[PDB]
Amino acid sequence: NLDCWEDIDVILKKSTILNLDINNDIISDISGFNSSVITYPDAQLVPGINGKAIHLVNNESSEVIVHKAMDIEYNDMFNNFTVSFWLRVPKVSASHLEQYGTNEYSIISSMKSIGSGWSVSLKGNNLIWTLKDSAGEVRQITFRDLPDKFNAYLANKWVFITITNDRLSSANLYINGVLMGSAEITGLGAIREDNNITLKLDRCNNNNQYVSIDKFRIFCKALNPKEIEKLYTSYLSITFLRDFWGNPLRYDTEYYLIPVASSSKDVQLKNITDYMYLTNAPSYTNGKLNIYYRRLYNGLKFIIKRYTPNNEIDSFVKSGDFIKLYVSYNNNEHIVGYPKDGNAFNNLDRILRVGYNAPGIPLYKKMEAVKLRDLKTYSVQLKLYDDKNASLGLVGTHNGQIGNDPNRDILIASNWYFNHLKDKILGCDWYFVPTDEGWTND
């Protein structure tokens, strides 16, 4: 066995030889080996999976260099190792796929005249892991991302990358703990890489290209699936809610809502004071490039507001936070709630109303933003309360009709969901999608 050095958490900690962390707006290695980290002028910091993350744009000043300490300098020459990091890449437009689809550029590398070592690179919608030994011998894992960009890994969402290397067998590439690619690597000689690990866009012809990298980490062993699962989920801090992209959910920000259980649906409004329902979102398809996705940014815009002042006006929404949900329609904001004795399906599934204002009729609008299930998904649940603080249920949808309107999946609040929180798919899970430069519909 060529690994180094029991409890999984202990193994993960002990086998870590490099761990980039960001505190006090400074990037440093907290592995204990103290490899020095050189941050260049245009390396930017942006919201991360748990704190801030490294943001790299396409210019010479945007880079972070890690100078390996002598104690780990030659750790991957003959022995096993694993590289892990959260990664976020913008969805590549149809135009850029045609124009730059064949341009392979590295983003993380240990390769310097022959360039032995390893590298993480991107080519169009392909994520590539490369190992090169001192003889120029090469081994690669090429991962072709899913055609459906709504579910793809290189389409603007934070995803967790993990690449294990067993010198006696093969290299395996994982995304969110799932095996996506592999390549036998036996027959490789010594790996003589550069003294530095460089995080930078190298040889990228698209000047507007950028990537985000977080928690860059290296282990001195080839992690097994169980360890990778624990590693991955260890970053999903359940106290802070996240938006569709994996970034922190924020107050006073416009979001489009999409039900996780019917991701091809957008939310629409019947009329002010009335109900909301689902409609099919338009879609984009390109046979030539073999890509497609339900288009985003259509439907109602929702805004989350603090029910009462939080900590120190923190901009991020915490699980357990009480809020007021509003719909921003024609520049006017209307609160979402359930009026006393309001129409409901079989007196159990309370039909939500937007901007309801019948005089003398109490409107229950106090909600709680929570994370009760599906840790790996960037979704949120919303619990509505009445005036006595009793639960009116979780926001979801119910199929049926109102008056003579067509059959529709109508937005409601129901306690029914609390008895099915273990289901794989549940109608009370919601994606909060904010407009982002990393995703423009073609």
If asked whether residues 123 and 251 sit together in one domain, one would say: no
Q: Give the contacts of 256 (CB within 8 A, at least 6 positions apart).
A: 266, 267, 296, 297, 298, 299, 300, 301, 302, 432, 433, 434
Side-chain-side CA neighbours of 164 within 13 Å: the count stands at 26
Contact 325, 385 (CB under 8 A): no
Contact 115, 193 (CB under 8 A): no
If asked whether residues 183 and 244 sit together in one domain, one would say: no
Distance CA 438, CA 89 (A): 8
Method: X-ray
**What is the count of structural domains for the chain?**
2
Distance CA 76, CA 303 (A): 49
Q: Which of 182, 214, 236 is the last residue of a domain?
A: 236
CA angle 133, 135, 138 (to 5 degrees): 50
Burial of 344 (0-12, 13-18, 19+ CB in 10 A): middle
Please provide residue 28's backbone torsions phi and psi, each rounded to the nearest 5 degrees.
Answer: -150, 165
For 408: left if phi > 0, alpha if psi spans -120 to 50, otherwise beta; the answer is beta
- Identify the CA nearest to 215 among candidates 246, 250, 249: 246
Q: Which residue has the tokens 């009462």?
A: 308
CATH number of the structural domain spanning residue 375: 2.80.10.50
Enumerate the β-bridge partners of residue 349: 345
- Identify the domain containing residue 80 by its residue range: 1-236
Enumerate the β-bridge partners of residue 391: 385
Can you read off the two tokens belonging to residue 378? Answer: 């960037």
If asked whether residues 164 and 248 sit together in one domain, one would say: no
Resolution (A): 2.0
CATH number of the structural domain spanning residue 78: 2.60.120.200
If asked whether residues 246 and 210 sit together in one domain, one would say: no
If asked whether residues 55 and 183 sit together in one domain, one would say: yes
Q: Which of 191, 213, 236 is the last residue of a domain?
A: 236
If asked whether residues 281 and 219 sit together in one domain, one would say: no
CB atoms within 10 A of CB 102: 10
Q: First and final CA of the chain: distance in angstroms?
A: 50
If asked whether residues 232 and 187 sit together in one domain, one would say: yes
Distance CA 145, CA 291 (A): 10
If asked whether residues 229 and 269 sit together in one domain, one would say: no
Can you read off the two tokens belonging to residue 322? Answer: 């009480």
Distance CA 223, CA 190 (A): 21
CA angle 297, 247, 182 (to 5 degrees): 100
